[PDB]
Structure 1
């Protein structure tokens, strides 16, 4: 069986396989090329992926996500302490190790973050197996450049418990560079900038590649800035509109809010291609249908400060790496959020018109690169 490349993201995961000199990004059961890093526990079953996210508003306390934020950390970890204040599921301390506590089939059960991720990993494996028509064992899993040894360890373990023989754990920016072939020897040193803006995190990495060896010269970004923050701005915008039209504040109703958020996220994707999208939600609050729409222009102004602030970490990365704008040779977009036109304009304007590498779907670039690497490693 071929070795596969797996991008284990904070919000979405993606799997690809190298076959006949071409990389195949494998779609799932619902035909999506990336699947939510969601796991859900109910009275009768364990849901994973799309099925899990498709019922989150109906089972918030038993639907787990953001496991990538817990993986490899200690319960006492300041990050953990700050984050758990926002999760609808329980996080308990087990001799210093954080554990997620959920109710499965009427019984109370807890899981280590690596066990949850192994679940998402299992779903990717079977997605690949369903496509390949053969058993998948060897794999290359990616991890952010800033992950320490514990985090890499935990990610490796999540893979082994998923029945995957992890050939190697490589950095996400490095995988991205490999996808574009920027690892090829050209008898010269090349500076590559990876701009990764996913569903929940923002990373900027400057890699220096010479003789085929990568050297992460600098990194920056924000661990709490991603596509979900954009959705939230839309949500707050529509809560206000609903109130204008029906003098009904739907903020208290968690279900209404979550249904609207899903509508927004979807409208947002449409906005990357069209100039306006419509929000059609039957019986949002009480029995009031919420039919409306947004234009790309309004979407941009709702998120203006957020989009603009994206350049702050870019400047920082440059100064730390001791390089000027003119010194970076290539720029590659990674993450679903980079499909946003305004973000592409902003970055390009910042680099005085330089062309951005974006021919490969940004949310597939990391998996794409890992698949190539997996192939060579086997």
Structure 2
């Protein structure tokens, strides 16, 4: 049968197929190549993807996301304790393991993380089946390089629940190296800088005669694009209060509409220098109309951009590497399109240029698809 490739990300998932000697990254039913990793349990309906994400605003306790943060971990791990305090849906202690609790038709229902991740995998599988017009039973699925045996096994178990045999788990850095087609011959040391919507990961990947090994990993589990948007929102919430004596945080619907326009404005400022953020009647009788420059966008976030170099220093130190030992810097995740990010990395690497695909959110799924093709021969 076919083997598909899935990037099971913290904030999103992406599915690729390898067919007629090319990788195709598939669109979801709404025409996007990225599906938000969200599942909602409201009014006796289950939704998966953007339709679930949209329920988060009015149904924050029934809308599950960021499950990758919980999968294969223990309820008392410091990281899960921190996540229970950040996440608005109920996380309960099932015999030492975090489980998700929600209501379906008012009934208390508990899920393992791998059961919610299975629902994201199910949807990616259905996109692949309808595209290939065949059943799909096998997949390459990616995980972070720092995932331990229980986190990898819990991801495999997610596959099994979704009716997917996970024939191979590969780390996200390896998947990126496969996508960018880094020469497998002789020896290459690669810094993989992966700045996503929710998380930052950096790995030293060494490629030696077609053998891939991650020598060191570090990161910041709570640093990504969504933080850069929150810094902009904070700024404009302050200004709108100053100007109109309206605190937009008093209206959940206003904050949702602002967040959407702020995300687009940030994307615009990776290409242009100045952009308009506009919402008619952000509340009744009050338009939101503001300009954001690249310079102000950077000023609002410069300490977070700069923070990304602390994990870079840690992996160089952990692997007893000097900046020079790094042969190529590869960038993954849409957040790496921010010019200032590219600039800061370059100057850290004493002038060296980094490589950024042009679909950096799809590189990991692309690599997983390539791995599927490699396995099929």
| Alignment correspondent of 2:136 | 136
Matches within 5 A, 1:141-156: 141-156=141-156
Q: What's the offset of the Cα at 1:360?
A: 4.5
Q: Which of 364, 367, 370 lines up with 1:369 in the alignment?
A: 367
Matches within 5 A, 1:265-284: 265-284=263-282
| Alignment correspondent of 1:75 | 75
Return the alpha-carbon distance in structure 2 between the equivalents of residues 132 and 279 of structure 1: 40
Q: Which of 195, 209, 212 lines up with 2:210 in the alignment?
A: 212
| Alignment correspondent of 2:188 | 190
| Alignment correspondent of 2:157 | 157
Matches within 5 A, 1:282-297: 282-297=280-295
Matches within 5 A, 1:85-234: 85-182=85-182, 184-185=184-185, 188-234=186-232
| Alignment correspondent of 2:23 | 23
Q: What's the offset of the Cα at 1:316?
A: 2.0
Return the alpha-carbon distance in structure 1 between the equivalents of residues 137 and 275 of structure 2: 42
Return the alpha-carbon distance in structure 1 between the equivalents of residues 105 and 183 of structure 2: 49
Moved more, 281-290 or 231-240: 281-290
Moved more, 292-301 or 353-362: 353-362
SS in 2 for 1:54: helix
| 8 Å CA contact retained: 2:61, 2:88 | yes
Return the alpha-carbon distance in structure 1 between the equivalents of residues 25 and 237 of structure 2: 37
SS in 2 for 1:349: helix
CA RMSD, Structure 1 to Structure 2 (Å): 1.5
| Alignment correspondent of 1:307 | 305
Return the alpha-carbon distance in structure 2 between the equivalents of residues 183 and 109 of structure 1: 49
| Alignment correspondent of 1:37 | 37
Moved more, 196-205 or 73-82: 73-82
| 8 Å CA contact retained: 1:143, 1:152 | yes
| 8 Å CA contact retained: 1:23, 1:371 | yes
| 8 Å CA contact retained: 1:57, 1:259 | no
Q: What's the offset of the Cα at 1:168?
A: 0.7
Q: Does 1:50 align with 2:75?
A: no
Aligned length: 376
Moved more, 288-297 or 6-15: 288-297
Return the alpha-carbon distance in structure 2 between the equivalents of residues 318 and 215 of structure 1: 15
| 8 Å CA contact retained: 2:180, 2:357 | no
Return the alpha-carbon distance in structure 2 between the equivalents of residues 267 and 58 of structure 1: 24
Return the alpha-carbon distance in structure 1 between the equivalents of residues 252 and 80 of structure 2: 24
| Alignment correspondent of 2:323 | 325
Q: Does 1:11 align with 2:11?
A: yes
Moved more, 96-105 or 365-374: 96-105
| Alignment correspondent of 1:340 | 338
Q: TM-score, normalised by structure 1?
A: 0.95
Structure 1 segments, 4+ long, off by >4 Å, are none
| 8 Å CA contact retained: 2:357, 2:363 | no
SS in 2 for 1:146: coil
Summarize deviations over 1:134-170 as a string: whole Å, max 9, x none. 2221100000010111100100000110011111111
Q: What's the offset of the Cα at 1:99?
A: 1.2
| 8 Å CA contact retained: 1:2, 1:375 | no
Q: Which of 347, 355, 358 lines up with 1:357 in the alignment?
A: 355
Summarize deviations over 1:104-131 as a string: whole Å, max 9, x none. 2332212111000000111111112222
